[PDB]
Amino acid sequence: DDEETTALVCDNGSGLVKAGFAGDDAPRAVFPSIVGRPRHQGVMVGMGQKDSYVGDEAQSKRGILTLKYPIEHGIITNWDDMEKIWHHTFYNELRVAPEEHPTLLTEAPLNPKANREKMTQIMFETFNVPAMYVAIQAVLSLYASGRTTGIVLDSGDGVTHNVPIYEGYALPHAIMRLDLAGRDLTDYLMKILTERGYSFVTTAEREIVRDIKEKLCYVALDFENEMATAASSSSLEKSYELPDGQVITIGNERFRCPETLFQPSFIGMESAGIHETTYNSIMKCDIDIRKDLYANNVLSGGTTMYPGIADRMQKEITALAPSTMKIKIIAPPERKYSVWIGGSILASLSTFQQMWISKQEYDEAGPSIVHRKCF
Amino acid sequence: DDEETTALVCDNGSGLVKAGFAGDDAPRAVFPSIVGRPRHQGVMVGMGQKDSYVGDEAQSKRGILTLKYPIEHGIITNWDDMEKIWHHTFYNELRVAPEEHPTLLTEAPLNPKANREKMTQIMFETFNVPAMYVAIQAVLSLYASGRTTGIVLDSGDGVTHNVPIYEGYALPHAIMRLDLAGRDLTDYLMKILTERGYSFVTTAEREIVRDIKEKLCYVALDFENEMATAASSSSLEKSYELPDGQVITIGNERFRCPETLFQPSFIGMESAGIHETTYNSIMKCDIDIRKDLYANNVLSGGTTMYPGIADRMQKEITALAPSTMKIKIIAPPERKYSVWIGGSILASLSTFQQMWISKQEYDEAGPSIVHRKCF
Amino acid sequence: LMKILTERGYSFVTTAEREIVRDIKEKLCYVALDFENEMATAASSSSLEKSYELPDGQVITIGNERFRCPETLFQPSFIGMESAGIHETTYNSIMKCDIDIRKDLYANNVLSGGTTMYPGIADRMQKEITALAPSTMKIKIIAPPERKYSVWIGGSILASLSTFQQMWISKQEYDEAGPSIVHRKCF
Amino acid sequence: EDVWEILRQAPPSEYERIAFQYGVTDLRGMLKRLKGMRR
Amino acid sequence: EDVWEILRQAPPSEYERIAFQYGVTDLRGMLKRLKGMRR
Amino acid sequence: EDVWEILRQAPPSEYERIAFQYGVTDLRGMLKRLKGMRR
């Protein structure tokens, strides 16, 4: 009921799905990627409970229903759930006809091709959008940076990687993977809370604990000195009302939860921390790209919302990087939605319809087309 | 407890260390050059786990321990680990007194002198062998050829070079370097397996994948035609029981892993493939040495164990070399141990003790001696 | 089981009733390898109606509960735990394990507990894994008859480890290092 | 600023570049606002 | 059996190991009986 | 073959050569077997 169209900038953020129109200032839809199964499924007069309309409704009315991510580990194992998820999206908070508007889709690196294959044809068929296009959430956040050069620590929704760049020029050889996720810190901190005399196993407990993080957990620049403090650091014992109501006490965990992103020994990953992954990616870089990398040390992720994260960056590099070069880590406050912003700009790139996955091109070339010479 | 002596033909094969006595028909010792750090180091009744007796024991009982090469990139960064490695060698599978027997050592071209300097004095002191001698693994394999003339593609344990020769006459100007290694193909194929919907990051996963190569991966003479086949080549989908137990599926990767030794674009080396490196070395050669080179196209390496490798040679040269000349690539089945065989013969060269690095010569001339007028 | 006994026309709330019922378990309750087939049997399985003298004296009747009490350790839905049964907990721990540790795990499927004294528990193990574990690998669950006291036996051996006094929490070490010592670098 | 004028005047290929040199690091911006016009 | 002799002869660190290979799965045993001597 | 005899008769410098012409490409061989005698 308007002019030509505006794109459908839709993000499948690892934890929450977020989206808006082309060039919107904020993805109007955001909510957990959960599927809900009411445990006991009590029989009452009438009904009123849908199985898995989780969206944002389920967690509030959580407990009976369990939690499910189709994309559990940044990779989706079930889709029926998931396409109904997008239907909820496009008809409950997008409440829009997909056929009406073009949509750009977020796909993470290392995906098997068939994943985007199907996501495509299903969106075509069920959603019959005018047509679609997809892009790497990492890459979309990278355009959200506008910083043509430098690496980005894309530790955002539920994934972590490094994205070395120069003038938009990134090396796939220079990009690695980090299975670490908000889920991982979740499991770790839940473990610690339990072992400290607590029963933290339940799903809603899982959401509560992540929130406990996001509003409480920080990271200390120094590790042992701050742990010695915690031996008697009477500052850090802030106890927080367990949302059920009894204040839950907190100590040094308020920081020593996520640092394991530098030391996965306690979380148990042979992998090396974020910092040295960035650094070795740096070494594999060419000679002088590295000063820019220092200056283009663009962080990304709201999961990385922790205090002193960037400063811990500069100091750790310093310990690693030569003092001769100068280190400048970037980290926008708008990092988790920066991916969606870059998607909105790129899909909004009305000079850039040509890359668009249309009905015909797909149909004549089937699913495989979107993969050859395009994405 | 016998007559004069027999040499100690010991190879520090880039991936595995191998060795035997003078003139042995096989290096009696072979095993990975790994160092093992048990990750969590669980406390139990008593002990029984040595840190880094990796040898061949560690990988079987792998996982807790990580992997370390002292010689990581054909060049050794740590030695304490490494001399204890040779102690394991000489006292666990050589189980012999180094002082008893002379030993010839394998050193690769382009080594900084100090490397062999120290390796020498440490072997003297710790091992007090009667005395020692060292030689280029490339050169030792080259005597293993007996082909006085021609170039050898020494793509063996973990390195790649070209060794143009004539009557044993090789040009250092005509010899180049290839960082490509079984490790490199390892990283590439691990990358591909992961991106195809797999989590291939773990060390034991690394050994498993190399084995997956060595028993599965081949190379196709043609690239695009065989890739078009793979579009529907129902032959190549052989899936192999992941050694954990679930059959891991395989497709075109069974070949398109190593070809990058001809095209380092996908592995990301500006360097040119093995074939054209050989060819340009050929051009720098004199006028007519080249026909012999064609006939002396001696391949080397078990890493090069792939099927049709030699045939791909002849065809690629053909595309390069004039049809006027006739191309004959050599490639023994005994190529990876050919280096050790040549070492055994040369050290066994009882007409050739005179080149031997003795106690005195070293002591009076310190470490530097072994480098001047000798090696 | 107290819940079930009560709901089947019984007043099982009292403490001594609690001990009695646990004993009723330990000497009666078993577990069936199959669930639905054995429940269909119980529809008419005239074997399983063994009634046991309530220790007060009146024989208490028993049916399929003699087995369907503990299986919930595999299905906590009826006991109401979102948690997954013992078997799949073992299995997912297995998956998180490294590549080839798992064959040993199959062979080292060591069960423990006298609470697990139930008949066919191990066999239910192998079958459930089989349904889970690849047939390629071979599953071997362990379960000593001496499982509940096996803990005490291991303690007796370890403490008896006269080569291992050094780990011992002594007067002084504690006193100078207070209570915290026993926790750092030791337990 | 002239970023409006010069990023509606510069090359497009180099609209990228010169938004990134002539002050519009948010070339991201420049296009989204160019679109706010043509969005 | 020789487990008595070889588990009073083997390493201790590897008394563990070789009770577990040379037949004394009850290294637990081997020590408790070694102790029945020294218990 | 006479490689045995002529490679225990030829020059040594040219033992190399004539193992490589008179059929013992494994001069490598010829020496290791000459050594199997003197090894």
From TrEMBL, chains A, B:
Alphabetized UniProt keyword annotations: ATP-binding, Cytoplasm, Cytoskeleton, Methylation, Nucleotide-binding, Oxidation, Signal
PROSITE patterns, sorted: ACTINS_1, ACTINS_2, ACTINS_ACT_LIKE
Main location: cytoplasm
Cellular localization per UniProt: Cytoplasm, Cytoskeleton
Matches recorded under SMART domains: ACTIN
The UniProt record lists the keyword Secreted: no
Annotated GO CC locations: cytoskeleton; cytosol
Superkingdom of the organism of origin: Eukaryota
GO molecular function: ATP binding
Gene3D superfamilies: 3.30.420.40, Actin, Chain A, domain 4
UniProt-listed PANTHER family: ACTIN
Similarity comment text for this entry: Belongs to the actin family.
Protein name: Actin alpha cardiac muscle 1
